[PDB]
Write a protein that binds this ligand. Sequence first.
Ligand code: FES
Ligand code: NA
Length: 558
Amino acid sequence: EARSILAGAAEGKVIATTEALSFWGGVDPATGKVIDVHHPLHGICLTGGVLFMPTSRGSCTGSGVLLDLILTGRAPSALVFCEAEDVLTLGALVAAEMFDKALPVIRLDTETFARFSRAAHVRIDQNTIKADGVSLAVAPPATAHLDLTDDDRAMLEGRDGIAVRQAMRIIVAMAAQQGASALVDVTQGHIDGCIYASPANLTFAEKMADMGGKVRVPSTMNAISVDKANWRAQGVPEDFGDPAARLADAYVRMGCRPTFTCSPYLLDSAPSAGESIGWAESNAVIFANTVLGARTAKHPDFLDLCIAMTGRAPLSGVYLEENRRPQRIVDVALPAGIDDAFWPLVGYLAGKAVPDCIPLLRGLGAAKPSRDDLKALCAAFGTTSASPMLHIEGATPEAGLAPLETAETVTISLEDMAAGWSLLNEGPEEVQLVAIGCPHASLEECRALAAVFNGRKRHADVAVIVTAGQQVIDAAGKDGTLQSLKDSGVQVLPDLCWVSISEPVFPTKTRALMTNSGKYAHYGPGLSGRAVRFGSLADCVESALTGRAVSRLPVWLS
Ligand code: FES
Ligand code: NA
């Protein structure tokens, strides 16, 4: 079978892979080249080709990256998946709805996906897809068999303005390709497209704001690409900082709260269990479903604003209880003597083992991970998987849900962990930067960082930078944690995250960095061009003191 998701026609090289790719962090919008150093397609330029991959993974920001690639002509000619997909499909949907450029997206059956992937040339139209001259019928897009309340139809008819109508059109089209049957109310939103990942990110926000866009539910804002109050004094180039600040300005104007944080679940406004929200940012989505028991799909950038403007989201995916049941079982080895570095590594490896469905992690309940531990795990899980949630037996409030009767069992062994640890430590021992706070550090994290520092001060050659939300930095000033960190030579930066940081705030002298973030360990090398080392919090501080990160497997892997 061949299903048309978004109509259109294309032709070019078959660029095929069996592993999902995040377009934000994995594809350079300036060149169209794969920059994920851990992906098989690394170094390949995707422009003009027909990309064959099972689905997407990682960042909600891939929609803005694809939209920019479409606007500059550097995009692939088309996208072929073999499973459900939202992020790239939404990006191509925004391109057709608001920007003229039709990129075709087709979902295949698995075996015709494997057959067509080993091909050399592929062509598409509204009718057919050819793999060297093996024409196959493409079934038309799925009919929207959706409920629309009277207020839904009224918004869709333009009774709340053109911006609200354009939001509803995108939501209804996304609901149609997701096979939904209705929309669902959301109580709050979290906008992720406020990162300046590409010029198109700003173009979309200004176009929605100039059409009258305003959010209907309380909506927070994710990390942005400037220290909003200080980027001019920091020497950030005007060519970058001005549109980056204007992008954040556009969403504040549309009524979003200027929280500028990728850990909104740490704010006083965090949702509770059973609450239906509309969140983007993959780590926050995963944390909201996994840890808090709230409900939100992993909404791509741009769709988050649409949901916030309407207060409505497609009733599909993990909004429904049946779709929250574990879809695969993962038996994780529990070695003795685990520290904080265990949890991001497990999340990273769990996503590689379960990249396309919801896992239940077994064998870890007695370990009692902190909220920060689960925070690091969910963030790392997001980088290697597409799923919006996971379960941890004996840790997360919904882990008792009956696994689906299709659920298979896989393992994460000690050998799996040693390979992953080495995978994330492809760098030297000399480091000039310690990167903490991806996602944004909690107050407990900043206090734990100061406790490990024990009043010492960093090596002069090693910068130590912590990214956190403004509200955490405000609280760290009250209880004295901030001054203690600055006593040790640590810089605490608001608004920015390591995903969005750039020179010169990212010190240009840096050749290698160490981080305690599994997420940034994966994305860091391609985003920064530097070598990246991964370790525990104390491994980071020791690197900060000595200038050096000892190349070694951890205590619990020896
Ligand atoms: S912006 Fe995604 S984790 Fe900080
Ligand atoms: Na991600």
